[PDB]
Design a protein around this motif. Structure first.
Motif, PDB file in Angstrom:
ATOM      1  N   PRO A  43      14.083 -10.805  -7.562  1.00 47.72           N
ATOM      2  CA  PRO A  43      13.081  -9.878  -8.104  1.00 47.72           C
ATOM      3  C   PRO A  43      11.974  -9.564  -7.099  1.00 47.72           C
ATOM      4  N   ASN A  44      11.586  -8.293  -7.041  1.00 50.01           N
ATOM      5  CA  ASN A  44      10.383  -7.891  -6.324  1.00 50.01           C
ATOM      6  C   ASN A  44      10.492  -7.850  -4.798  1.00 50.01           C
ATOM      7  N   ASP A  54       5.871  -6.108   7.551  1.00 51.48           N
ATOM      8  CA  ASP A  54       4.465  -5.765   7.725  1.00 51.48           C
ATOM      9  C   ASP A  54       3.560  -6.791   7.014  1.00 51.48           C
ATOM     10  N   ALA A  64      10.135  -1.481   4.286  1.00 48.69           N
ATOM     11  CA  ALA A  64      10.649  -0.326   3.560  1.00 48.69           C
ATOM     12  C   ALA A  64       9.581   0.568   2.941  1.00 48.69           C
ATOM     13  N   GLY A 112      11.963  -5.536  -2.925  1.00 45.07           N
ATOM     14  CA  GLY A 112      11.985  -4.184  -2.388  1.00 45.07           C
ATOM     15  C   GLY A 112      13.340  -3.505  -2.518  1.00 45.07           C
ATOM     16  N   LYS A 113      14.109  -3.901  -3.524  1.00 46.67           N
ATOM     17  CA  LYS A 113      15.415  -3.288  -3.703  1.00 46.67           C
ATOM     18  C   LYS A 113      15.299  -1.792  -3.987  1.00 46.67           C
ATOM     19  N   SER A 114      14.471  -1.422  -4.962  1.00 45.28           N
ATOM     20  CA  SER A 114      14.319  -0.012  -5.322  1.00 45.28           C
ATOM     21  C   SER A 114      13.723   0.806  -4.180  1.00 45.28           C
ATOM     22  N   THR A 115      12.727   0.238  -3.503  1.00 46.81           N
ATOM     23  CA  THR A 115      12.079   0.890  -2.363  1.00 46.81           C
ATOM     24  C   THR A 115      13.115   1.237  -1.291  1.00 46.81           C
ATOM     25  N   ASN A 149      12.968  -7.674   4.582  1.00 42.83           N
ATOM     26  CA  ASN A 149      11.942  -6.721   4.206  1.00 42.83           C
ATOM     27  C   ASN A 149      10.525  -7.297   4.234  1.00 42.83           C
ATOM     28  N   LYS A 150       9.544  -6.407   4.121  1.00 42.08           N
ATOM     29  CA  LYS A 150       8.135  -6.771   4.086  1.00 42.08           C
ATOM     30  C   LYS A 150       7.672  -7.413   5.393  1.00 42.08           C
TER      31      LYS A 150
END
Ligand SMILES: Nc1nc2c(ncn2[C@@H]2O[C@H](COP(=O)(O)OP(=O)(O)NP(=O)(O)O)[C@@H](O)[C@H]2O)c(=O)[nH]1
Ligand SMILES: [Mg+2]
Length: 160
Positions: free
Chosen positions: A12-13, A114, A141, A15-18, A111-112
């Protein structure tokens, strides 16, 4: 045109959708009725993408975990893109190990990056890659950085 089947999976959370929107151009502003299937084209080939429900593992403890596991086993994606949060690696790698165990053709999207950078957290990507034996793609992303790298890594990984 030759097509391949790709699944996104991760905690969860993460960044899958992003990442799904970034790759496929779907759901131009998500979170109303999110699309979980789409596609992109890269170097003359087509990549169909499915965004699987967020899971922490692949045991049989929730509807989402059962849905995720059945897809990988029965639908046999050409590539599983395991999206992981660079700022919570240990937590994410639990799901990662189960994916390796079931023989999935795997690629890691980290991901993430940054967020990691701004929090002083350093990830040795080359070392993580060597240890796991899976390719690792660093990205951010939400800043739309590293998305073409991901498309490229995917197109190579589906042939491996
Ligand atoms: N700093 C940072 N935040 C990001 C990045 N990608 C996504 N996020 C943030 O992380 C949160 C979750 O995004 P989302 O893509 O919806 O995650 P998800 O994996 O789809 N969640 P779910 O499991 O509910 O489906 C959002 O606040 C989003 O802005 C990134 O590269 N960097
Ligand atoms: Mg989502």
């Amino acid at each position: 045109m030759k097509s391949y089947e790709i699944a996104l999976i991760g905690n969860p959370n993460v960044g899958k959708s992003t990442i799904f929107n970034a790759l496929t151009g779907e759901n131009v502003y998500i979170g109303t009725v999110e699309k979980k299937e789409g596609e992109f084209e890269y170097n003359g080939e087509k990549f169909k993408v499915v965004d699987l429900p967020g899971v922490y593992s692949l045991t049989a403890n929730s509807i989402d975990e059962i849905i995720a596991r059945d897809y990988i086993i029965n639908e046999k994606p050409d590539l599983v893109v395991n999206i992981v949060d660079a700022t919570a690696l240990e937590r994410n790698l639990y799901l990662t190990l189960q994916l390796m165990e079931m023989g999935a053709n795997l690629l890691l999207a980290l991901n993430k990056m940054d967020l990691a950078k701004s929090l002083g957290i350093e990830i040795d990507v080359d070392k993580l890659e060597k240890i796991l034996g899976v390719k690792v793609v660093p990205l951010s992303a939400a800043k739309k950085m590293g998305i073409e790298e991901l498309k490229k890594a995917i197109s190579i990984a589906v042939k491996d």
